[PDB]
Design a protein around this ligand. Structure first.
Ligand code: TPW
Ligand code: TPW
Ligand code: TPW
Ligand code: MG
Ligand code: MG
Ligand code: MG
Lengths: 530, 523, 530, 141
């Protein structure tokens, strides 16, 4: 078996679904075996940033390994940022970068590309030894899985075709029987002894597909359940569904206190930081806080190493007597609906109504891909079937690329994208690849003519005023159907159309005025004053 | 006086002509000063890469300092690429990243693509640090990194000093010069190659004087292209390896006393490769050093080395200007035939011969660059070594900003334009009207010429011309050579809006230069 | 200030006392600045192994940084083993290896030397940037101190003289106020709740010179105190002196049980392994065991990170009410004495008697340097003033070299060395450097004509039979006074002489017969049968 | 040394490249015109054939070259120092070489020589031997 093949098969053997990428000198031989073998569908994008962003999503979507293939040099570096956000958000993107042969020895910078990716991945390896390649691949791949984060793989070209033995399974990671038990023991003990124990569900839960067993726990535990942002959605159809989502300040002040004022706050697979919605360590009692994350548990200031979340859970159940309990009790949830189909100018919230109404009228929910900006804060109030945005990273550019990658693996489902003018100027052009990719995602451009999120924080500043890019009129070039709307009528009307029109990506240019924000973005700002 | 203010001033004194950037939370406080103090012009773009390329171009244009202002995280990262290629081609792009408050890793990455960094978290030190970093950027001509905590943009600081002098081993300088000169005189067929550093440190005059006194054959590199063309001893052409003229390539590579003055060594297409020359008999002066076979003199800035040699060579009136080191393709037959690269070159060269003034040209990667190589220009900016796409458009933009009125020409392939091409939407607010000739062959042709069998090099039809409108510019698509000639003419007559010329080119049609390149890889 | 100088001064500023080493092509320029500056005394040895072994001891002796200077290539690699044992035993040896200039670019193996030392040190760095050198040095040096283990420093020759700014202080390491407190709390709580809490004193205690405060703790704690091997000696003149030393099986079965059967076994700065005397994790209740080591505390299966032993102690006192208590109570200790000055053949134990008697007669105790083999197990029963041997490492070769390095910094004191024939054949020749070094250590060769320690475990094997190297007769060549003894008379007599004769190293070749072992080595073997 | 280094078609058959004293340095030759066959490979200017064990390469070339009787044995590629003047002068390396070489010339059979690092090696180089083992590249004592 050829080396490059042995790899792709491996990726496949692990639930891979595609391989996004852009070729270059050194990467052609590998794209060749990628194409000729036909192992993994080869989708190619216009700019490397979208390459990584799509891989990110194709990974988050199916909760499996994403695949970003780039060429040596500018190709890799031009994608660094996409991998960073993927890393930042436990999105296991397997990066592959063709490198010079092992007999061409000289670089161009005073390795380097390696040290940069060494910086944003969990494991890396230069496949320069056909003998060691197999296990090495198994290792690194085994890492992105164990840790759910990006990995780096360099393949010198004169090695893309070296015969190698097939790639086996992931190397078995460390797990101590006793250690674990002791951990659960202390964890459960800590919970039982708490006043207001609050169990939070986050990202690691959706990555290791553990929702299945955590629902069986949320029940046998008996404590209140809340989700973080990355956790939003989880346990929706579970016996003891979350009582809401935590996004901090801009959120339901009711949920807030419950979390920030607990003494049994069990952060399951949760992320920790001061990234907007993330659970800031500054806003909680570090004393009584069990923090399960990255195969480790830390509460009481001490830590339990090599403790896979799966195991922690599995052993927590072994100590919790089964329960037939259930806290559902009617009441769904109230989203902003009712659009004034009049000719009054659009506002972020109006759009929400727009989509929501369509849905309540009977429309199946489309998963949403949102870029960073006022489009994100507006997407929170929309009924979905999975949301997908850079909340804990704020990496503009995501939006469109992400939605694309999504619909590329959706196996039919359609993807909805929301993005502002400022971000569309960055990656909104990746739609030109929608024809070749055979997908028709619906996009809602939030053209407010400025970097509005930045203006709210420094309105005296002019530089945040942008030009009026006639996007709707540009959608024809990339082969789509564009439509700029000024009023709520042209808005509701256009959307309906979009769902009817398939085969071509639908781009609805929403004309919004500066100042006009979203309810959720409103609350967020008001909350930074006091 | 604020800190930001002090940096901006410190920046302007060293040549700064503008500031390209894109804000974010941490950047905001910094940008407020920027915008207000108006020390430097604050030009915003759309995507970080552009900002990086633009800033890079700006610097090169005025052989001065460039300035890219980003925000912490996604912002800074999404711009690493431009800074790298900058580092590669010795362009001092001063990177300014806003960052977290000091009371409230990117740093570890940048250290890998800048010859100097610093985090100004102490106002008492800020003044000197700024003066140290920029210093290097100037001394080594490479990108530097400055990371500012938003809670220090206003902190008062002693004015920024002057650059801190660098080690100049006066004795080695004199000893090298002797070895160097002797090494030359004593060689069968010695040759002088003028490269990148000669431009960056504005040493054209000197090297022009030396070129004559040293009395040896002259040649430029790819980045050395266009230097000493008005000197008594002009280059015999430009060496770019197998690609170009085989008489110059043979001379360069066969020399037994090669003097790479401020050049770059690298197996990287046009860069003077170590596998092509006889390094044993090479005198490579670079990064303030000089090598030559089991010997490297350190601390010898190029500039002083010239002076050294000049002090060791008697004056001369030896002038040897002949005819055309390189025949520029002309005579565009405006018939109905489809279009081809070399035709674009003629179309372009003819206007010039017709009397038009040669513009400076900015090129992205792809055949557009090889094509630009057969065009008459007044400067040529392109990633000839780094070879990274995207540079084209934003670089032409960036150039024209500080080109005080002069118009810039930009050649970009379809593949590349899809990455940065849209930055043209800023032309309007930016007060620019650059001309763009987009090579739409509907494919990543440069690669197809390496794997014509693969089908992924097949791109769809992007009606770029139809999109020019939406960016406040005029964009026309042409298929024949007749249409090509007419449209190019209109562009030049139309100023006020950027002009986009989407020239449709068949897959398989390559520039002459590129043709030669591929054929040389078959051998 | 020159780079190489800036460094040596740094070492000095940190308590350095010398710089052992062997030069080579690439290392000459650095030895030149080492010599010319005269900052640190430059002692040179015959073979690299002794270079590292002496540095090891010069470090352990004064409990400070040792200094091993070698040349690139064979020089470094030929010393790898010495550094390993130093690392293995928390001996902060600062290794310095001159490297090719930054403009000579090509190696000879398919970096490498760097990766090998990366493997046996705690921090490393290639000083190739005069600007960054200072802080870098401070860093690495700061590491060997914080972690008390070997560090690697590579100095390209064209950099030995680059002007640099002086080297500042060590970079401040992480320390969490809360975390710490929480740790002590749980630690003390764990202790108080124990039945037979046993506090052990080990290596880290002597390295960070903490004995001063630990004695103040051993008192305020109130629990039994025992020392490990590396810990042997500590708290001797303390209010609550150790009740004995723990060396496992071969030790006082009385001490053994107390340790292996505790539920409050506080291993202070202790090492953990199955290395002869070390506290094997296989022989203790991991459940109730506080393990303070490498700036971390682990008990109850969880761990407290970035917890410097100093701090742990300092905060433990803050929670223990001062005490005037004391458990001294006469009884010193009984060592094997009384030598039968008859003409009966020598046995390991006889020699012990020999030295001991001399001491009780009034001789000040000499610190001892013992190699691995039956000489070590015999040295345990000798009255000393500090013992120094590879107990937790078993790296033969140590002996002599070590003793030499010692007396090189002893500031006058004399050093005693014990070593078997088999090890003397490895490094016993380093005595030839005793004249130039101006020291006269007394050495006791245990020539049993074989690798006796190995023979006891496989007596049916012949290969353990060695030849009769006439060492005593070889001592003249290296410029010493050699004397082979066959009987206990020639033994007692020779020793007395040796203490009288100064200026020349004294080598007493003790003729012992195969089979004849040491009491302590006896007990050890008998203990491997059952 | 001049011939080797000036060659415009150098064929290092199973050699080692390295700037390491006696090892054939890359800075001394014209690598562009070098054919270095090593570690089961063959290089030559922007080209490296992999998987070509030396042995087979020879055979290859032999299959491409007609037989020959071209013999060119001359005299002493290297004059071995002899004639040890056994006077009372102190001793010197080259003398040891003569002492050694003379016994051989006197008829004694050349032995194989093993040398450590130091001048002893350079000295062994002027001695008549039946094999010479020494660390000429690694240079470790
Ligand atoms: C890669 C990168 N570069 C810059 C920034 C900085 C930023 C954070 S928010 C924002 C404004 C976004 O404008 P948009 O039209 O998309 O939506 P809206 O604000 O409602 O007008 C910027 C520029 C980030 N986060 N990432
Ligand atoms: C950031 C980056 N990613 C990939 C590549 C690799 C590449 C080198 S050449 C080429 C094809 C360019 O197509 P284009 O339309 O621009 O011009 P042409 O080939 O003549 O049709 C690619 C993808 C580079 N150099 N930089
Ligand atoms: C560097 C190294 N190489 C080999 C060995 C293996 C060994 C462990 S014990 C022993 C015998 C030592 O004989 P010695 O004369 O010194 O004393 P004695 O046993 O009483 O006769 C050997 C060879 C070790 N530990 N280290
Ligand atoms: Mg907007
Ligand atoms: Mg193209
Ligand atoms: Mg022995």
């Amino acid at each position: 078996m050829k080396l490059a093949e042995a790899l792709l098969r491996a990726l496949k053997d692990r639930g891979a679904q595609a391989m996004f990428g852009i070729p270059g000198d050194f990467a052609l031989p590998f794209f060749k075996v990628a194409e000729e073998t036909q192992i993994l569908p080869l989708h190619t994008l216009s700019h490397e940033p979208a390459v990584g962003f799509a891989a990110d999503a194709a990974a988050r979507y199916s909760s499996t390994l994403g695949v970003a293939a780039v060429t040596y040099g500018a190709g890799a570096f031009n994608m660094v940022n996409a991998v960073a956000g993927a890393y930042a958000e436990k999105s296991p993107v397997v990066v592959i970068s063709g490198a010079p042969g092992t007999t061409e020895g000289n670089a161009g910078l005073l390795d380097t590309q390696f040290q940069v990716f060494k910086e944003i991945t969990v494991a890396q390896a230069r496949l320069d030894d056909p003998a060691k390649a197999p296990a090495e691949i198994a290792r690194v791949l085994g890492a992105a899985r164990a840790q759910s984060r990006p990995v780096y793989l360099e393949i010198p070209r004169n090695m893309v075709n070296a015969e190698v033995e097939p790639v086996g399974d992931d190397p078995a990671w460390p797990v101590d029987r006793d250690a674990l038990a002791a951990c659960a023991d202390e964890v459960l003990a800590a919970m039982r002894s708490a006043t207001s124990p609050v169990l939070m569900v986050c990202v690691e839960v959706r990555r290791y597909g553990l929702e299945a067993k955590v629902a069986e726990l949320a029940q046998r535990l008996g404590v209140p359940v809340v989700t973080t942002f990355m956790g939003r959605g989880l346990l929706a159809d579970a016996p003891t569904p979350p009582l809401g989502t935590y996004i901090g300040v801009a959120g339901d002040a009711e949920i807030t206190r419950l979390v920030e004022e607990s003494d049994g706050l069990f952060l399951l697979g949760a992320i920790l930081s001061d990234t907007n919605f993330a659970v800031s360590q500054r806003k909680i009692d570090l004393r009584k806080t069990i923090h399960a994350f990255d195969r480790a548990v830390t509460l009481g200031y001490h830590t339990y190493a090599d403790i896979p979340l799966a195991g922690l859970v599995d052993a927590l159940l072994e100590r919790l007597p089964p329960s037939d309990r259930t806290t559902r009790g009617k009441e769904p949830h109230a989203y902003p609906t009712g659009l004034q189909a009049d000719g009054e100018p659009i506002a972020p919230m109006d759009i929400a109504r727009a989509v929501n109404d369509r849905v309540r009228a009977g429309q199946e929910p489309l998963l949403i891909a949102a870029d960073m900006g006022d489009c994100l804060f507006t997407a929170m109030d929309m009924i979905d079937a999975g949301l997908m945005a850079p909340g804990y990273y704020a990496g503009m550019g995501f939006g469109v690329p992400a939605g694309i990658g999504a619909q590329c693996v959706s196996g039919g489902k359609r993807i909805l994208t929301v993005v502002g003018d400022g971000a569309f100027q960055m990656t909104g052009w990746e739609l030109g690849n929608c024809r070749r990719l055979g997908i028709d995602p619906i996009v809602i451009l939030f053209n407010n003519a400025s970097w509005e999120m930045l203006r709210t924080f420094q309105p005296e500043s002019a530089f945040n005023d942008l030009d009026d890019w006639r996007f709707a009129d540009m959608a024809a070039g990339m082969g789509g159907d564009g439509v700029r709307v000024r009023t709520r009528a042209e808005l509701k009307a256009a959307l309906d159309k979009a769902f009817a029109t398939r085969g071509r990506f639908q781009l609805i240019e929403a004309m919004i005025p500066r100042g006009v924000l979203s309810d959720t973005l409103a609350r967020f700002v008001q909350g930074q004053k006091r």
